[PDB]
Amino acid sequence: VPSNATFKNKEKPQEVRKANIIAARSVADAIRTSLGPKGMDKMI
Amino acid sequence: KILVELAQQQDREIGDGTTSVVIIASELLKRANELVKNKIHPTTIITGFRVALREAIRFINEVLSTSVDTLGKETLINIA
Ligand SMILES: [Mg+2]
């Protein structure tokens, strides 16, 4: 059950995908406050 | 820059009142700063100012005075 089959290598892509999701959800949080009739305008 | 462009605007339409339009607009935002601390959403704050404005414009038209007044003009001299 252990020690057999295969072992995962180069686990950085697992962290790269996490860094891409966290950075994308951070952008979606600022625009989330503008959703619906109760949303607010964003001055840039 | 909004009140800067608002003071420059007031000259275009009416030509007078650049002093009163800035003080009123600054006070509407000043008292609304405590209204958002109540958690009241701006749409409720904006609607409260607009519904009160619709009744305010109608009230001004009810309290206006005609230019007739007395026999002589006695208006344009006092207007200036
Ligand atoms: Mg004046």
From Swiss-Prot, chain A:
Give the residue spans that cross the bilayer: none
Q: Where in the cell is it found?
A: Cytoplasm
Which positions form S-S bridges? none
Q: What else is known?
A: Present with 5530 molecules/cell in log phase SD medium.
Subunit comment for this entry?
A: Heterooligomeric complex of about 850 to 900 kDa that forms two stacked rings, 12 to 16 nm in diameter.
Described by its record, this protein's role is as follows: Molecular chaperone; assists the folding of proteins upon ATP hydrolysis. Known to play a role, in vitro, in the folding of actin and tubulin. In yeast may play a role in mitotic spindle formation.
**Homology family:** Belongs to the TCP-1 chaperonin family.
Protein name, per record: T-complex protein 1 subunit delta
In its UniProt entry, the species of origin is given as Saccharomyces cerevisiae (strain ATCC 204508 / S288c) (Baker's yeast)
Q: Which residues of the full protein are shown?
A: 5 to 48 of 528
Curated annotation (Swiss-Prot), chain B:
Subcellular localization(s) per the UniProt record? Cytoplasm
Which family is this sequence assigned to?
A: Belongs to the TCP-1 chaperonin family.
Please give the function described in this protein's UniProt entry.
Molecular chaperone; assists the folding of proteins upon ATP hydrolysis. Known to play a role, in vitro, in the folding of actin and tubulin. In yeast may play a role in mitotic spindle formation.
What subunit structure does UniProt give? Heterooligomeric complex of about 850 to 900 kDa that forms two stacked rings, 12 to 16 nm in diameter.
Record-given protein name: T-complex protein 1 subunit alpha
Q: Which organism is it from?
A: Saccharomyces cerevisiae (strain ATCC 204508 / S288c) (Baker's yeast)
Q: Which residues of the full protein are shown?
A: 81 to 160 of 559
